[PDB]
């Protein structure tokens, strides 16, 4: 009891709960039972009906049973070629795409200018340029020294003013 429990709990490099192991073992059991019965490895549709009657899960189970492989392991022909040397760091930052973002900042800096100080005010407020957060509009008008929510009034006084650098298409390029 202690072995089989400690076996199911420790052997997996990625830990699966006890019942999940009970399942896969039942699956391998019913497989070997249907193995000698059909002279062929049984279809997923066949295996499913006998034990859990659900085909989608059996597929899912058979992937759980799949044991991972080592990065440090190599290819047989030459002892220099290890697997990890082929794994592309998907995390790492693309040079051009990050630089292009930087050039997008220089275009919005040429937008904070044509816009007024009131106009370039609510812009960096609800969008959160210097902040990093999008504050609720009923808090933005009250945190700012102009009232009668005239800051929402200035909003529409900008939406069309932004159409001109949009009609200059200098912002149109950076969306595609």
């Amino acid at each position: 009891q202690a072995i089989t429990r400690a076996m199911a709990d420790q052997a997996r490099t990625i830990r699966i709960p006890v019942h999940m192991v009970e399942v896969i073992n039942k699956l391998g059991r019913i497989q070997r039972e249907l193995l000698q019965d059909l002279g062929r490895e049984p279809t997923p549709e066949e295996l499913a009906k006998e034990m859990d009657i659900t085909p989608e899960k059996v597929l899912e189970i058979q992937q759980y049973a799949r044991e991972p492989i080592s990065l440090d392991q190599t290819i047989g022909d030459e002892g220099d070629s290890q697997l990890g040397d082929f794994i592309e760091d998907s995390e790492a930052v693309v040079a051009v795409d990050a630089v292009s973002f930087t050039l997008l900042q220089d275009q919005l800096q040429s937008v904070l200018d044509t816009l007024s100080e009131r106009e370039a005010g609510v812009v960096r407020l609800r969008f959160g340029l210097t902040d990093g957060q999008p504050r609720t509009l009923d808090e933005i008008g009250q945190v700012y020294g102009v009232t009668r929510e005239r800051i929402r009034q200035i909003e529409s006084k900008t939406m069309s003013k932004l159409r001109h650098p949009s009609r200059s298409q200098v912002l149109r390029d950076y969306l595609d």
């Binding site: 997996r12 490099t13 990625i14 830990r15 699966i16 999940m20 759980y64 995390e91 990093g132 957060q133």
Partner: protein
């Protein structure tokens, strides 16, 4: 981050040096979860110990914005900095 430093010294590491390095003791052999595919707590990839998987994204998800910087969420104790830290943050194991 100036490039010019004069000397590179090597020594025999104290057991106390080991604990001064580490941001926490690994107590579980578990790597990740089998469903969530997330670093399980107090494990080999625990985000409380080594850091966040995604930039400024806290483990429990209570903090998911760049606005919180250097904030230690109370529900899972994960500092919010880049996943760039998981290449520099150490751990340790306390042998009995």
């Amino acid at each position: 981050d100036v490039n010019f430093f004069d000397e590179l010294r090597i020594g025999l590491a104290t057991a106390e040096d080991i604990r001064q390095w580490s941001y926490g003791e690994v107590k579980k052999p578990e790597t990740i979860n089998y469903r969530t595919l997330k670093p399980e707590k107090d494990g080999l990839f625990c985000e409380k110990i080594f850091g966040p998987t995604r930039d400024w994204e806290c483990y429990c998800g209570k903090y998911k914005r760049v606005r919180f910087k250097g904030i230690i969420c109370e529900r899972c104790g994960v500092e919010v900095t880049r996943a760039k830290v998981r290449r520099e943050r150490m751990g340790h194991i306390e042998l009995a």
